[PDB]
């Protein structure tokens, strides 16, 4: 039995992202997996890290420290319920797939806010549980990313650089740091520019990949992997 | 006479970010610069890229494409007024400083959304008209970043990898894309770890640098600079 969380960040059901999201749901559902989707925009998911993320009265309301207050709210069970709902889905999941359009060589702010607010100290990492020992060790994470720019652009000497370069903050700084093993990213280059046939072929490739997802080994999430 | 915009992202005025923001204001105001701060959290700045960002008839209301719809909105002067307001600030600034704590090797979501929403096509870039031909050419940008991780952690052979690696999406993918010339980042490592006196040093060092900021030249915002040979 396997349990997947899809964290989906696109405003339009009929987008290329929406299609990627839906074939993941359909294939993983067809395999018999437990599937849950956090459709961030439909949820009006709050992106801002603020003192409203802590219910009750703050531990030190004089000088508001987000990292400390959230750490302490997580331990005292006083986080906002939007955050705790997300944490229960992550806790239960064996795999977390992130389905998003690349925005400024990173994730859309709404998704960034999910990272920022859900992955708090005590839940996702602690001292000493980070990187290989992060608190989510034993889970898999996969970034399924679409781009505006072409694969040629995204090379070591193309105008955008190697697509691995932009993956570092997300795969290493974020997912590795919380102890996920990182599956290889799914990158779907320039759908707006591809033909009907090319776009179908990209959806197809992803569907196929999912059939064997559970067989996969994680990448070595290293500076060498991203930059070497 | 120079005009600066500081885009500032921290919830707490008494924070180390707040002190950096305020020494910047102080010093730049002392020089006689014109200074504007966007205090994002204070402003309840909207981070989410949504259809609320266009006021008029969408080009294709059946299938919402944020990039397309905002570009056209920019050209029709139909963007949400919060976006327009930031754009005017940017347009008038000679220098844009981003003041923020590192969150997940990047900017805090609220600031990410300022990037996502403010830097739309037509305003910050066209196709063609990007990177060196981006539309914000002849402006300067500077990232002033604070971190939890120590400088050592942020080396090439340490757990976080080199500081420069995490700058890439911000310096190259965003700022250089839009035409900015990028000034060398100010990175204030691990204040929470530093002593009071070490913290003071870091604040004073930023103030000292600002004294001669208009004499600086930008970095070469290339793969090489960020990643080595
Ligand atoms: C703020 C912002 C910043 C950006 N920054 C970057 C950046 O740093 N780098 C970069 O490279 N790009 C950037 N982009 C562009 C962005 O990454 C792309 O626009 C996005 O990845 C495209 O995916 P989408 O799902 O919206 O495409 P869609 O526009 O939704 O897809 C293209 C076409 O595919 C069709 N389609 C949908 N489903 C299917 C299917 N099953 N079969 C066939 N066709 C299908 C759609 O109907 C549409 O015609 C940025 C965009 C924004 C808005
Ligand atoms: C969601 C999240 C994700 C994070 N991700 C990362 C990450 O990827 N990488 C990473 O390295 N870190 C990360 N961090 C850590 C974060 O970057 C640091 O906590 C932040 O940079 C510290 O800056 P601050 O202004 O909040 O410091 P503060 O906590 O406000 O400052 C530290 C101390 O300086 C004192 N001080 C304030 N003003 C002065 C002054 N003028 N003179 C002397 N002392 C002064 C304050 O009183 C305080 O005691 C993350 C934090 C969060 C919440
Ligand atoms: O609420 C909180 C959420 C996240 C953090 C993250 C810290 C962090 C520190 C590093 O040195 C490297 C890193 O990749 C991440 C701290 C508080
Ligand atoms: O509203 C917007 C619409 C599109 C974009 C695109 C950005 C982009 C940025 C890059 O560094 C490389 C690239 O190939 C594309 C930005 C804002
Ligand atoms: Zn890693
Ligand atoms: Zn560059």
Curated annotation (Swiss-Prot), chain A:
Keyword Ion transport in the entry? The reply is no
Q: What is the top EC class of this enzyme, as a single word?
A: oxidoreductase
Q: Provide the catalytic activity annotation.
A: 1-(beta-D-ribofuranosyl)-1,4-dihydronicotinamide + a quinone + H(+) = beta-nicotinamide D-riboside + a quinol
EC number(s)? Answer: 1.10.5.1
The residues the record assigns to binding Zn(2+) are 172, 176, 221
- Residues with Phosphoserine modification: 78, 195
Example of a GO MF term:
melatonin binding
The answer to keyword Iron-sulfur applying to this record is: no
Additional comment: Uses dihydronicotinamide riboside (NRH) rather than NAD(P)H as an electron donor.
Q: What's the name of the protein?
A: Ribosyldihydronicotinamide dehydrogenase [quinone]
From Swiss-Prot, chain B:
Control of this protein's activity:
Inhibited by melatonin, resveratrol and 5-hydroxytryptamine.
* Sites of Phosphoserine modification: 78, 195
State the GO CC annotations: cytosol; extracellular exosome; nucleoplasm
Might you give the EC number(s) for this enzyme? 1.10.5.1
Question: Could you give a GO molecular-function term held by this entry?
Answer: FAD binding
Q: What does this protein do?
A: The enzyme apparently serves as a quinone reductase in connection with conjugation reactions of hydroquinones involved in detoxification pathways as well as in biosynthetic processes such as the vitamin K-dependent gamma-carboxylation of glutamate residues in prothrombin synthesis.
> Could you identify this protein by its name?
Ribosyldihydronicotinamide dehydrogenase [quinone]
Q: What is the lineage of its organism?
A: Eukaryota, Metazoa, Chordata, Craniata, Vertebrata
């Amino acid at each position: 039995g396997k349990k997947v969380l899809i964290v989906y960040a696109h405003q339009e059901p009929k987008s290329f992202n929406g299609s990627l999201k839906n074939v993941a749901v359909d294939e993983l559902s067809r395999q018999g997996c437990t599937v849950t989707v956090s459709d961030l925009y439909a949820m009006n998911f709050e992106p801002r890290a603020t003192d409203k993320d802590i219910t009750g009265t703050l531990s030190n309301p004089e000088v508001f420290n987000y990292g400390v207050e959230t750490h302490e709210a997580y331990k005292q069970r006083s986080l906002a319920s939007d955050i705790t709902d997300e944490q229960k889905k992550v806790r239960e999941a064996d795999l977390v797939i992130f389905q998003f359009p690349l925005y400024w060589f990173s994730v859309p702010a709404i998704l960034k806010g999910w990272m920022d607010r859900v992955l708090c100290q005590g839940f996702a990492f602690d001292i000493p549980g980070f990187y290989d020992s992060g608190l989510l060790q034993g889970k898999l994470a996969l970034l399924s990313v679409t781009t505006g720019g072409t694969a040629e652009m995204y090379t070591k000497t193309g105008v955008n650089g190697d697509s691995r370069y932009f993956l570092w903050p997300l795969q290493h700084g974020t997912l590795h740091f919380c102890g996920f093993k990182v599956l290889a990213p799914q990158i779907s280059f320039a759908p707006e520019i591809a033909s009907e046939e090319e776009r179908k072929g990209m959806v197809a490739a992803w569907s196929q990949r999912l059939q064997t997802i559970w067989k996969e080994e994680p990448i070595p999430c290293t500076a060498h992997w991203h930059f070497g």
